[PDB]
Amino acid sequence: APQQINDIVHRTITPLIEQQKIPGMAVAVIYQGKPYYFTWGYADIAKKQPVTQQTLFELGSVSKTFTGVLGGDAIARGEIKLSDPTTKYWPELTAKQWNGITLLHLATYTAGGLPLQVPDEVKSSSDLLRFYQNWQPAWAPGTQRLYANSSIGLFGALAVKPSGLSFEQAMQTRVFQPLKLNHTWINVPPAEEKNYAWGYREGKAVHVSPGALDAEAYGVKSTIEDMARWVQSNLKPLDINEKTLQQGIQLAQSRYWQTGDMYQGLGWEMLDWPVNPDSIINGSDNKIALAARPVKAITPPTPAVRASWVHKTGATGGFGSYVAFIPEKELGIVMLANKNYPNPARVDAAWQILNALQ
Ligand SMILES: O=C(O)c1ccc(CCCNS(=O)(=O)c2ccsc2C(=O)O)cc1
Numbered sequence: 001a002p003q004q005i006n007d008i009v010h011r012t013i014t015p016l017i018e019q020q021k022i023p024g025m026a027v028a029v030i031y032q033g034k035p036y037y038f039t040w041g042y043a044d045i046a047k048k049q050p051v052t053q054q055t056l057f058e059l060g061s062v063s064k065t066f067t068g069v070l071g072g073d074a075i076a077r078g079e080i081k082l083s084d085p086t087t088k089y090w091p092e093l094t095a096k097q098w099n100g101i102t103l104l105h106l107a108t109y110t111a112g113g114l115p116l117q118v119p120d121e122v123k124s125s126s127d128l129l130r131f132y133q134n135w136q137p138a139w140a141p142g143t144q145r146l147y148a149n150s151s152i153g154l155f156g157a158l159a160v161k162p163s164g165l166s167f168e169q170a171m172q173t174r175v176f177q178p179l180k181l182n183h184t185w186i187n188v189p190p191a192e193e194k195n196y197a198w199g200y201r202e203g204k205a206v207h208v209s210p211g212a213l214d215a216e217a218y219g220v221k222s223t224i225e226d227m228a229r230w231v232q233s234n235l236k237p238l239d240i241n242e243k244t245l246q247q248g249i250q251l252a253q254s255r256y257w258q259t260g261d262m263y264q265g266l267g268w269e270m271l272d273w274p275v276n277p278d279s280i281i282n283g284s285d286n287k288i289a290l291a292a293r294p295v296k297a298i299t300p301p302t303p304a305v306r307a308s309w310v311h312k313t314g315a316t317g318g319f320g321s322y323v324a325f326i327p328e329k330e331l332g333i334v335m336l337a338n339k340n341y342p343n344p345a346r347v348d349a350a351w352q353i354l355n356a357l358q
Pocket of ligand 1: 060061062116149199206207208209210217218290313314315316317318
């Protein structure tokens with residue numbers, strides 16, 4: 001814990017906790033590709049369990065980075081292509097709005113206005129089919145970006161189909177396990193319950209509720225230690241010994257689409273570094289992050305650019321997190337908190353810390 005890391009992290013996170021009234025938080029800074037951890041406050045207020053380096057947090061949409069990388073890995077394995085029609089892997093989707101909608105579109109929220117959430121009315125596999133069959137695009141495919149669980153959710157489920165494994169099984173065996181993320185979970189097991197923080201929403205203890213495509217779109221829980229390892233694995237995919245995985249991490253950080261200052265990868269979003277912090281800070285606020293935006297195609301996709309700020313925010317009703325790293329600088333940060341507080345606040349903190357270490 002170099003005193004300068006200590007200094008920036010404390011001067012930055014202390015007023016962040018106080019002003020946002022965050023009950024518990026873990027922060028990892030990756031500096032020169034080595035992790036340094038910081039924990040505050042409570043995993044469980046009622047039971048006075050402190051946040052530790054073992055506490056599980058719900059990642060929310062940061063789960064989409066795992067999804068984009070398990071997708072990338074299926075690509076590298078030869079099992080899927082992003083140029084393939086959604087219908088190759090779901091022939092029952094016969095409604096003709098599906099014509100022209102490829103897995104790149106599902107992955108990058110460019111299919112033509114798939115909604116943000118799957119309706120809670122959808123619980124069975126037949127219900128989900130019905131949902132996608134009935135859906136009417138607002139736009140032609142690859143013209144507009146609209147952030148959507150129902151979009152990258154479906155990417156995740158179709159992408160694992162030719163493996164013959166369930167999504168969770170594919171995730172575990174091709175991603176969590178080779179990267180040694182042994183306390184990262186889609187479903188948290190009884191033995192691990194004791195590490196599972198409560199989320200806090202209006203002062204009530206909550207956990208994520210089950211939902212269609214939850215695992216694929218918002219369903220990973222993880223510790224600050226594995227999340228640091230996750231950052232390290234995406235900072236330096238070339239130290240990854242597993243070829244399809246190292247290659248899927250590259251593919252998740254290719255640039256497929258640009259809107260304004262940002263580039264859409266698989267799960268990840270990227271901006272050229274040096275970035276203007278106003279750009280990433282303001283861009284992180286939801287009604288601009290969740291807004292319908294026109295995209296320009298990157299034809300062909302730019303391979304992972306090292307001088308990028310690569311990041312993803314994610315929330316559940318009781319959790320807020322953020323991951324950001326700069327490959328060229330070997331620098332990254334993870335921020336896990338068991339309160340959902342505004343995204344700008346998160347990115348603002350992350351940028352002040354990484355800027356000063358930059
Ligand atoms: O605490 C609970 O009971 C609960 C919380 C969130 C959910 C849904 C997760 C919301 N996160 S998301 O991926 O769907 C999303 C959507 C718009 S922004 C965003 C995010 O994670 O930042 C379900 C149950």
